[PDB]
Write a protein that binds this ligand. Structure first.
Ligand code: CL
Lengths: 297, 298
C-alpha cells in the first residue's frame, strides 16, 4: 500500500552499533547522503533524488529512530537522539558501504545532524548542504515571544515525557498533517504527493515513532544546544565547503539573512533563497535539485 | 455530583451585555470580588472565602467563559476573552449588585483581569491583590530558551485553532490533572480538596470550556500583550493600593523578583512571597487568607 517513490533505487538495511539504518540507494559516482527531518522520512527526497542520481551515488536514509530505521533505546540525556550521536551512527552506516568521505545534504532535523557531523568530523565530508535551517543554538538565542509562538513545537515536544506523548496519541493524523501544511507556502497539503503524505502519516501513527521524535526535540533543547554553545564559545567554524538554501517563506525574514548567520558558523559557505516554504524538496523540487546538482558537481 | 464547597453562601447568576456571570455570595461588609484562573473555577477560593466572609461581602465569580458563566462566541482577535473585555464584563456584573467601587483579588488569569481592570478603570477599585502573576507583558518580554521550556503552555495554548483543542480532546482528564499537579510545590494533587479537583475536571471535560481557555491564552499572546505594551511604554502605573502575593515555588518568580517588577507597574504596591507553589489559596490557605484579610482591612 505504501508507494515506491524511487524508481531505480534499491532498498538497504545497514547495520550499525546502535541499530539498522534504512536507505534507498540509487545511482553511481561520488557518494551523496540525503537526510530528512521532522515529521517526515527519507521519502521527502523523492522529487529531487532522481536528478541527483544522474550524477551521484545517492543514499536516502531514514534518521536513527525514524521511518524504518531501528529505534535505539534512549536515556535520561536523550543521547541516541542527539545530533552528535545520530551523526556518529550515520558515519558507521556509511562505513558499512565503504564511504568514509562523502557529500551530505540535510533538511530540518537531518540538516542538524549534518552540520553537527561537519563540526565533529569534518574529514568525513567533501561538501555539505543544509536546507531551511539555522543552527540550534541560533534558534534558541532567537527564542523571544515571536519565535516562541512560531516555533512552539520546539518547547512543547521537549516537555518531560509523557506530556507530549499523551497529547499526540489522541489524533496523530491531525498533528502530522498540521506539521506538514503549516510552514508550506500554500498553507495546505497540496505541495506534497499524497503517497508521500501517507508515508509520513503511517510513521507518525506509531507511538514508538512519536516518542523518538519527542526525544529528538528533548535533545534539541538540552544536549544539542550545549554542544552548539561550546562551538560558538570556541569560535569553531565548519571548514567543509557549504551551501545554505532557505525558503523565502520559511525562516522568518529579519535582521541578517540566513547566509549572514551561516557565515558566522562556516568559513566557506554560499547560499540562496528558494521560492518556497519550509519543505524545499517537495514545494520547489526543480529549483532545489538544480541548486544541489550545481553545488555538489 | 458536584459538591457545595461554600456551605452557607448564596448564588447569583448575573446578567451582563456579554453573558451571565455565575458567583457564590457570602458574608457582609465591604464588597470583595474574588477571581480564579486556569484551569480552575470559582471553587479555588473555598478554603479562604469563609474566613474573608467574616469581614467582607464576598463575591466569588466564575470568569467569563469559565465554570458556570456563559461562553460568548469569540472572534479573530479573541475579544471576549481579552482581560480588557473580561474586566468590562465583571464591572457590569458588579454594577448589577450595586457595587461601583469594590475590593478585588485575583489569581492567575483572574489576576490578569484584575490588574487590567485597575489600568483601564482605577476608580472602580478601593484596593487590588494579585496572586502568583507578573504582568503578561513581563512574561513575554522575559521570553528565552529557559522560559520557553519552563512555561510552554502560553505558546502551546495560543496556537491557532483547532490545534490545541484537537490535542486536548483525546484525554482531557490527564491534561487538567497534570497541570494542577505540575504547578504545586509537591508536584501532585495532595494540596487540593478532591471535591475541588472534580469541579475543575468537570469544567475541563466540556470542549466548549476548553476552547474558551485556549481563546484566553490566544488573547494572552496577542491583544492582552499589546494592551500591556501600550501601558509600559507610556509609563502608566496603577494608582490603586496594591498587594502582590506569589508562591516561592510558583510561576511568577522563576527568574524575576516579583515586587520589583510590580513596582514598575504600580505606584503604591506592597508584596510578599508565601511558601507555596502556584495555587496559593489551596496550597497555603491560612497564610493567603491572613494576608488578604490584613491588606483589605487596613
Ligand atoms: Cl496566568
Amino acid at each position: 500500500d505504501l508507494a515506491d517513490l524511487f524508481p531505480g533505487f534499491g532498498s538497504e538495511w545497514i547495520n550499525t552499533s546502535s541499530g539498522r539504518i534504512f536507505a534507498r540507494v540509487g545511482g553511481d559516482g561520488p557518494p551523496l547522503l540525503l537526510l530528512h527531518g521532522f515529521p517526515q522520512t527519507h521519502v521527502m527526497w523523492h522529487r529531487v533524488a532522481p536528478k541527483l542520481a544522474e550524477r551521484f551515488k545517492v543514499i536516502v536514509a531514514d534518521l536513527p529512530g525514524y521511518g524504518w530505521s531501528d529505534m535505539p533505546e534512549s536515556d535520561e540525556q536523550h543521547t541516541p537522539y542527539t545530533k552528535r550521536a545520530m551523526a556518529k551512527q550515520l558515519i558507521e552506516a556509511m562505513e558499512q558501504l565503504g564511504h568514509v568521505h562523502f557529500a551530505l545534504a540535510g533538511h530540518d532535523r537531518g540538516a542538524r545532524v549534518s552540520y553537527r557531523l561537519a563540526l565533529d568530523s569534518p574529514g568525513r565530508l567533501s561538501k555539505l548542504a543544509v536546507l531551511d535551517i539555522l543552527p540550534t543554538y541560533e534558534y534558541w538565542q532567537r527564542m523571544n515571544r515571536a519565535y516562541a509562538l512560531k516555533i512552539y513545537h520546539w518547547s512543547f515536544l521537549a516537555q518531560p515525557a509523557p506530556l507530549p506523548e499523551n497529547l499526540l496519541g489522541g489524533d496523530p493524523d491531525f498533528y502530522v498533517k498540521a506539521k506538514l501544511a503549516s510552514w508550506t507556502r500554500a498553507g495546505d497539503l497540496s505541495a506534497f504527493d499524497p503517497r508521500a503524505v501517507e508515508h509520513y502519516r503511517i510513521a507518525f501513527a506509531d507511538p514508538m515513532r512519536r516518542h523518538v521524535m519527542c526525544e529528538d526535540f528533548r535533545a534539541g533543547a538540552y544536549a544539542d544546544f550545549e554542544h552548539d554553545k561550546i562551538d560558538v564559545e570556541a569560535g569553531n567554524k565548519i571548514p567543509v565547503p557549504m551551501l545554505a538554501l532557505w525558503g523565502a517563506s520559511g525562516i522568518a525574514q529579519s535582521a541578517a539573512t540566513p547566509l549572514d548567520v551561516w557565515r558566522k558558523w562556516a568559513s566557506d559557505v554560499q547560499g540562496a533563497p528558494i521560492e518556497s516554504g519550509h519543505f524545499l524538496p517537495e514545494e520547489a523540487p526543480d529549483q532545489t535539485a538544480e541548486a544541489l546538482v550545481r553545488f555538489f558537481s
